[PDB]
């Protein structure tokens, strides 16, 4: 029932977590953030990365 990501849809497939504890989204679907395989190390979403 809960939704996530920039697409605001339910969880599905592989999800990646934003490493900014103050992130307003926290979890994203891999494809929505252009990922096929998980990146190494800490990762920050597009919303927290941009100005």
């Amino acid at each position: 029932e809960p939704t996530y990501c920039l697409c605001h849809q339910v969880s599905y497939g592989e999800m990646i977590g934003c490493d900014n504890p103050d992130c307003s989204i926290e979890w994203f679907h891999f494809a929505c953030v252009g990922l096929t395989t998980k990146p190494r190390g800490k990762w920050f979403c597009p919303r927290c990365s941009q100005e």
């Binding site: 969880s11 599905y12 497939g13 592989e14 999800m15 990646i16 977590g17 490493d19 979890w27 891999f30 998980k38 990146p39 190494r40 190390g41 800490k42 990762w43």
Partner: peptide
């Protein structure tokens, strides 16, 4: 990065 597979 931290990831998780959607549980069924």
């Amino acid at each position: 990065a931290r990831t998780k597979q959607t549980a069924r």
